[PDB]
Ligand binder design. Structure first.
Ligand SMILES: [Mg+2]
Ligand SMILES: [Mg+2]
Length: 302
């Protein structure tokens, strides 16, 4: 209530993952450099994340637990960014010309990926966050690399109706992503979003997302311990962010079951296997505050 401006609507978690993409992009041999992460974080103007994104916060100068936590998170964002980038590039290489980025936040893919002529990319998010990123990148002189259409409706509200109004065509194949979202949703909110995707999809449509397989009652106290130790490290640098209040530890239908029941084929790629494939250090125990993240790609069957 005490701020009114666009940048103050952007969630800390969106800003944090963008700052980590900025760090990842400077690594020698980086899988991906999101060249818009640093300037978007700077525009958000949360000082801690500006210092992180810019490299003013130097991991060589940090206590070992902080330096290791930042390097492993940057590697998690390297693999995640690579995964979702390659999902879209594979989908358009297979003839898909309609893409939807759900809760698009600070995702710069409509400005940095190659999209074939005739592609439309729809971005769905709450209006202030939509308006923030569009105005910020326009002011930096970064034109989109595709026909880009925003849908300024929170995923909690009637976004399908607004997506149709923006010119979405439910008769052609769609490539959907929901990146960094499903672990923050209730079981009911997850099933509703997967119903909405399915209802707007024709066969040959594709969807990529994550399954946070370890966020459950079995592992709750261990993961809450990781999240409290991380919260303490953030407080030392002037950020108040307790991830434990943002995740749901309760029962749910695994998204992969839910998709299979709705007629999707799925393919699961573990963080463990993607880090090994790309020659990066393992992310486990204390360095995995959400446990093992499973990246999922799905195709709707006829
Ligand atoms: Mg340690
Ligand atoms: Mg069960």
């Amino acid at each position: 209530g005490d701020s009114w401006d666009l940048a103050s609507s952007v969630g800390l978690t969106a800003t944090m993952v963008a700052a980590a993409r900025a760090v990842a992009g400077r690594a020698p041999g980086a899988l991906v450099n999101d060249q818009f992460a640093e300037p978007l974080v700077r525009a958000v103007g949360v000082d801690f994340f500006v210092r992180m994104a810019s490299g003013e916060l130097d991991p060589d100068e940090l206590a070992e637990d902080e330096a290791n936590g930042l390097r492993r998170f940057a590697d998690a964002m390297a693999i995640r960014t690579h995964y979702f980038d390659n999902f879209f590039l594979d989908a358009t290489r297979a003839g898909i010309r309609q893409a939807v980025i759900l809760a698009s936040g600070l995702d710069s893919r409509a400005y940095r990926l190659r999209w074939p002529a005739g592609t439309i990319v729809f971005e769905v998010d709450q209006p202030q966050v939509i308006d923030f990123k569009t105005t910020t990148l326009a002011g930096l002189g970064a034109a989109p690399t595709t026909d880009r259409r925003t849908v300024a409706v929170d995923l909690r509200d009637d976004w399908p109706t607004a997506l149709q109004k923006a010119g979405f065509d439910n008769a052609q194949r769609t490539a959907w992503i929901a990146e960094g979202l499903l672990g923050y949703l209730s079981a009911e909110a997850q099933d509703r979003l997967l119903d909405q995707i399915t209802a707007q999809s024709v066969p040959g449509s594709q969807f990529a997302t994550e399954v946070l397989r370890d966020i459950n009652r079995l592992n709750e106290e261990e993961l809450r311990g990781r999240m409290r130790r991380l919260a303490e490290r953030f407080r030392r640098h002037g950020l108040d962010l307790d991830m434990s209040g943002l995740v749901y530890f309760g029962d749910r239908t695994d998204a992969r079951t839910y998709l299979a029941d709705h007629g999707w084929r799925t393919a699961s790629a573990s963080t463990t296997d993607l880090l090994a494939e790309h020659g990066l250090p393992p992310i486990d125990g204390d360095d995995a505050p959400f446990g093992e993240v499973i990246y999922v790609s799905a195709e709707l069957k006829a």
